[PDB]
Amino acid sequence: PEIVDTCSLASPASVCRTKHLHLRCSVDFTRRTLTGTAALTVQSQEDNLRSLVLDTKDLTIEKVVINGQEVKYALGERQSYKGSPMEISLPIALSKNQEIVIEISFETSPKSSALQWLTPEQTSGKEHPYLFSQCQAIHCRAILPCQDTPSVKLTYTAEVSVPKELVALMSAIRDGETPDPEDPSRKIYKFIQKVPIPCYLIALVVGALESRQIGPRTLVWSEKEQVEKSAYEFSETESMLKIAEDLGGPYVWGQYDLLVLPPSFPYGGMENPCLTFVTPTLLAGDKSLSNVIAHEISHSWTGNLVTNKTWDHFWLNEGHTVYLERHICGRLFGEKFRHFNALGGWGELQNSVKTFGETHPFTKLVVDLTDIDPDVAYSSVPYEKGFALLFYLEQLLGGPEIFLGFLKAYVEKFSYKSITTDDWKDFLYSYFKDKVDVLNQVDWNAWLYSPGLPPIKPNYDMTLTNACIALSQRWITAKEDDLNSFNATDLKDLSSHQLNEFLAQTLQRAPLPLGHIKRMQEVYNFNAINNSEIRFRWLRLCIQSKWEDAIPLALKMATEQGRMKFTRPLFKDLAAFDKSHDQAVRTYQEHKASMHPVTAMLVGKDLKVD
Ligand SMILES: NCC(=O)Nc1ccc(OCc2ccccc2)cc1
Ligand SMILES: [Yb+3]
Ligand SMILES: [Zn+2]
Known part of the structure; x- marks a missing residue:
């Protein structure tokens, strides 16, 4: 065996x-x-x-x-x-x-x-x-x-x-x-x-690294010119560590330092023990992208203590980490906020499944990486399909307090070990022995081994999402004579998270008419927002809607940082836009040699270059 x-x-x-x-x-x-x-x-x-x-x-x-x-x-x-x-x-x-x-x-x-x-x-x-x-x-x-x-x-x-x-x-x-x-x-x-x-x-x-202390067990490290901004951006780190310890059990790693890397760092974060690595694109100036820190913190239990035995079972690392991540955010900002982020995650799962295709092997939760380069398979699927399964189980099995009990017992059980999906499922059944009839009602084969969206979508509170959907639908259904009605006051009661979700909702239906996009810039001035997640989605919306003005802005963001979540879709969008296609390729060729080796490889494949 x-x-x-x-x-x-x-x-x-x-x-x-x-x-x-x-x-x-x-x-x-x-x-x-x-x-x-x-x-x-x-x-x-x-x-x-x-x-x-x-x-x-x-x-x-x-x-x-x-x-x-x-x-x-x-x-x-x-x-x-x-x-x-x-x-x-x-x-x-x-x-x-x-x-x-x-x-x-x-x-x-x-x-x-x-x-x-x-x-x-x-x-x-x-x-x-x-x-x-x-x-x-x-x-x-x-x-x-x-x-x-x-x-x-x-x-x-x-x-x-x-x-x-x-x-x-x-x-x-x-x-x-x-x-x-x-x-x-x-x-x-x-x-x-x-x-x-x-x-x-x-x-x-x-x-040339310098450090500043920001908590009892946390220094932030970066080059000198980023230290002060990083210290402020990540100031809630100890409070998140405290919540994580409550959920997962003791932090066994001693220190929890942060390193803010140069812009070419390929991911939002990496949960290196004792020293989480993060992208400088988190430095929004208002701490709004802190869920990435909550994610890397959570890995100190799920992933670093309990570890996937092979990469086929990566969802174990990520699904549980995202689950813990969103509970940290829920405790910090409220349960309606946890549901908002969960529902957003379903939306990202939709995008990924639509990108790969609903029958594609990489949309399965448990995958088979035989003769597949992991970097090529990498996507949001193990994250969000994994979270969706756990969120579904939470609601099936009696709620968050009950399922968090399972989470802590699970970390305790498999600490310092590497495990498979069957190991996880066996313990799930063990732990919820008195609810096996409920467990036997889930379509395990579909959830674990079938491609596409999950067989059942969890229940999500809509409170915080409703305004985003309503505004996105106003824009999508707007005709030219409706454009005058939009105004900066539209955004008055939306958080940065809600502005991001508004753009995500609208990008799902892109392209929009060029005139709508021009009006959006006229009244909302999205060009002015430096928040990397918002700017990313705004620029994608502009390029997919064929606004040539956005071409230099998109090329700039694609190259001045290298987080693959941003760089790859921006290059691919620029490639698909006939007006920017040749320049997108030229720009990749010019930058290739100085890019992160993995990022260079994947953008090349995306662009069908070399
Ligand atoms: N934050 C760094 C990170 O997550 N990098 C990374 C790189 C490659 C990985 O691929 C693993 C894999 C496992 C199953 C399905 C698709 C891909 C997983 C993670
Ligand atoms: Yb009309
Ligand atoms: Zn992770």
Whole structure:
């Protein structure tokens, strides 16, 4: 009854398991390489184990040492996005449960899909270079040889040599700094991660970083020019951590720091333990995009403690995290607000299913990533279809207080483990044993394994959404002689969240007539809003409605930041608009080399370029 991770070429957990990584490396900005040694403490799960295989991707291996002597190893042929398997011949056959240390000397490639190297010009300060990693889902193998599967969890320690003027941070507790004895122009930063983690949660950033304390267990880190704005934007972090602890149980990770990255960071956030990474596009100036922080906080339980065993079961990570996320927002801002955000999430699920197609394999909750690059499959589906299932179960099983009881018991049960959907379902049934008749009424096969929208839509309070729908419908049904009736006062009683939902509702019916869009700018002045989510949707609405004036604005947003949620749809819209098509392609070509490697790959596919 053993499980296989079809995204990894390494030996499975049933054969051997990495227990610890000690990384010693040096960051060479001149060569854009990370060079050093990864010492893996590995425990045999088999009798008479004589070899094992590790994942690698575009790595250069110098040597492998065990027991102080070099051993034989072989790199297999590259298997596309999975990389190349590295088979290691053990000097002495191992008995079950025996542990040894394997020290591998390696160097990364400048084109490592895990890394983005930034020139000084690409940073805020314009004087120093900058490096950051992004290992999820399967890019850790592009930094170091490892069993690159979430089915294995390990602790780690690291020593990182960097230019003395720069700072290194990792997904771990800081353990001091000293000058580098082998090069006085450099400093060594040390780190300890004492809680076992999957290797996709290993993270490294190197740059001219400064910190400010914003809570009892939270520093914000960024380049100097962003520190003050970040400190204010994320000031509710400790209050959210407090609520999360109430819902999930104790926070076991020690510190909860935030790092605000350069604009090319590909996602809204990444839940790296001890150090959440976030996009600077959260800096709206009014804390309105703070749900992303609530999301990353929640991962400290769902995802980082209870982890998906393979990426086929990613919805376990994201569905429960979004569920907890929206409860944090519900406690902060009220239950009607939780329902508003939930209903918005259904709307995002609609968009994703319509984008992929209602029969597409990636619209299933549990997917099959055999021979599929995870970055290509990545979408809102596991997030929102996952949340929808949990929200549906909440309402079926007696309400939020009852289901939050399940959530906390679930985290407790599977803490420090990696699990499948069947593990989750088995415990759901165990926990709600007295309500199995209700559980047996859900169409499990449809919810878990069928494409398309779920077989049943949950009940949503409409209170906060109603004004958004009403105004969107006024615009959509408006004829030319109705345009005069619209006025800035229309927006008087709408929050930024409601303005965003108004645009989301309207974008779902785009295009609108060009004259309507021009009137919208005339009376609402949406061009003036810097809120990234609002501006994103407004610009999409403009381009899809064929307003040439918006072309430079859309091109600017698409390139001045690199969050894929924004950059990909903007480029795709610009490509589909005949007037901007050639310029969209030219702009991608010009920027490609300086984009994040994953983002460059996906925009290229989207644009059918190269
Ligand atoms: N916030 C970073 C992040 O979520 N990145 C990431 C990158 C790739 C991933 O793909 C996983 C996957 C798993 C199932 C279905 C589609 C895609 C999942 C997550
Ligand atoms: Yb009329
Ligand atoms: Zn997440």
